[PDB]
Amino acid sequence: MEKVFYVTTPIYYVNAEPHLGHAYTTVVADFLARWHRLDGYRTFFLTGTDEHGETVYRAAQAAGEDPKAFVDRVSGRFKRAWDLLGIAYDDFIRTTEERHKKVVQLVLKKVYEAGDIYYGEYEGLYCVSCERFYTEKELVEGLCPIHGRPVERRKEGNYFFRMEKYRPWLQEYIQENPDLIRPEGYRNEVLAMLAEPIGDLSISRPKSRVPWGIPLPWDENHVTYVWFDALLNYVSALDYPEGEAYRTFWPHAWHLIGKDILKPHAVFWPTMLKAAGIPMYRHLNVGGFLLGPDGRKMSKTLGNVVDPFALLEKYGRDALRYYLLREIPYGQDTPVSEEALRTRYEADLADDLGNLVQRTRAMLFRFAEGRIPEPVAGEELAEGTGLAGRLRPLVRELKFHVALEEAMAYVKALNRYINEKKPWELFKKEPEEARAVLYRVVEGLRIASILLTPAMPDKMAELRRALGLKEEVRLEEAERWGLAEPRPIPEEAPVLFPKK
Numbered sequence: 001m002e003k004v005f006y007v008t009t010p011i012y013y014v015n016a017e018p019h020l021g022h023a024y025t026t027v028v029a030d031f032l033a034r035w036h037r038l039d040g041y042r043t044f045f046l047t048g049t050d051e052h053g054e055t056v057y058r059a060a061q062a063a064g065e066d067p068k069a070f071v072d073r074v075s076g077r078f079k080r081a082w083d084l085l086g087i088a089y090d091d092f093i094r095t096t097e098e099r100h101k102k103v104v105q106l107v108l109k110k111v112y113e114a115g116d117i118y119y120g121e122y123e124g125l126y127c128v129s130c131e132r133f134y135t136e137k138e139l140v141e142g143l144c145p146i147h148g149r150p151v152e153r154r155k156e157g158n159y160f161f162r163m164e165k166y167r168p169w170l171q172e173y174i175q176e177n178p179d180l181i182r183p184e185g186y187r188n189e190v191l192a193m194l195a196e197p198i199g200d201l202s203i204s205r206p207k208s209r210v211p212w213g214i215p216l217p218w219d220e221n222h223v224t225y226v227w228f229d230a231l232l233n234y235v236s237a238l239d240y241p242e243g244e245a246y247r248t249f250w251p252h253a254w255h256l257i258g259k260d261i262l263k264p265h266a267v268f269w270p271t272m273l274k275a276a277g278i279p280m281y282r283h284l285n286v287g288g289f290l291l292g293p294d295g296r297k298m299s300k301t302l303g304n305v306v307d308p309f310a311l312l313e314k315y316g317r318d319a320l321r322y323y324l325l326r327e328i329p330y331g332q333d334t335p336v337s338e339e340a341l342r343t344r345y346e347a348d349l350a351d352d353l354g355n356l357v358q359r360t361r362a363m364l365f366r367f368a369e370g371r372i373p374e375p376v377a378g379e380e381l382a383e384g385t386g387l388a389g390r391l392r393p394l395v396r397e398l399k400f401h402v403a404l405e406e407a408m409a410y411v412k413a414l415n416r417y418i419n420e421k422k423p424w425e426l427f428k429k430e431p432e433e434a435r436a437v438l439y440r441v442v443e444g445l446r447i448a449s450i451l452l453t454p455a456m457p458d459k460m461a462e463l464r465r466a467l468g469l470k471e472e473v474r475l476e477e478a479e480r481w482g483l484a485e486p487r488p489i490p491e492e493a494p495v496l497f498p499k500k
């Protein structure tokens, strides 16, 4: 009713093996969602797969499999992948689902009846083998990417959407809403395109060419092609018309995308919503490219490709997520490598966090009889309760690297604290002081673990379990000092982050 959060990731092409780019955007959405769930927000985190089209159709035909049966099996590679990355999405939308088809046809009819749709002719480079149109850039120097054959100018009957008519409105909307497209840099690029005519939008293709897809309500001989299909998922998953979910979440829609699909989300999408009578989204959040270790765009030929799943099996899901959130500023092109991840893992996780936990546990068994000491003021460590409040705005503004840098900064402060106070020496003189010092460390770690939960859900819960703290938490608990209770700690706990 008040605190509402809705985040979406793009709907990914089904016949595409999940890669680093899909992993990053999805992990960022997961973090954003987990964080808000923790801040007491009624939240919805959506993800899904794009399954229609002729490429997908021809791939199914090759394997001698039914189209539906094909996407059904391959869409699962994404579900399995998200399972491995620990993605807690609320819904997984598939464009072949009935609920989606229903909404697409519904928005199509409404827009067609509004007179924004007309039959026309599309012209351009065409590949007879592909049965699809290409643009200059899309052509690998003259010829078709696949088939490597010459394309020829061709025309084809297509239904169009009067998108140009909406350019004036869109231009001004972005001018009136400077926060619409989060990373500022990107907001200036959209405005540049709206300065020139954007033209009309082809929204269909003959079933003769594209037999796999959603038919137009007024012309079953045609199929919805891309746009009015994939884009509507954001609204389809909410049962848009009479759905409670649509009424609750749509008003706070946060779209996460990569810069590659910026025009479709910043220009096309807003005008389709306008013509459909649907309110504009709240924010379009653009992430940059995760460049190879050589600072170049990942690629086979360059052999600079980084596989997240291989890296996940080596260091674990928690390590991977942390590295990507702490090391890559959202919106900026950043190179990634296995070396950068191993360093962060060695320093931040295995040493600063894991060792401190292992160290504190050993010291509780020795100086506190295997139990958390009696609560005491935090002194210079009490300032950590003001982190949640300083992090909230940092997170909302897509500054995840700065947020985590702050949380880990506190963890480093904890290390320095215990290394300075030296509880094993203070015990000889005053046991009460040694215990006091230890309590501040367990309570300092409790708070830290909370702040880091969205980044490493399993590991942070493991940290609390290992210190006898309450596993399930809420961000508000990280704002009050003295919550850790004096209870025994598990006699044996595995090393949080083992040596690799």
Ligand SMILES: [Zn+2]
Pocket (backbone or CB within 6 Å): 127, 128, 129, 130, 131, 144, 145, 146, 147, 148
């Ligand atoms: Zn081709």
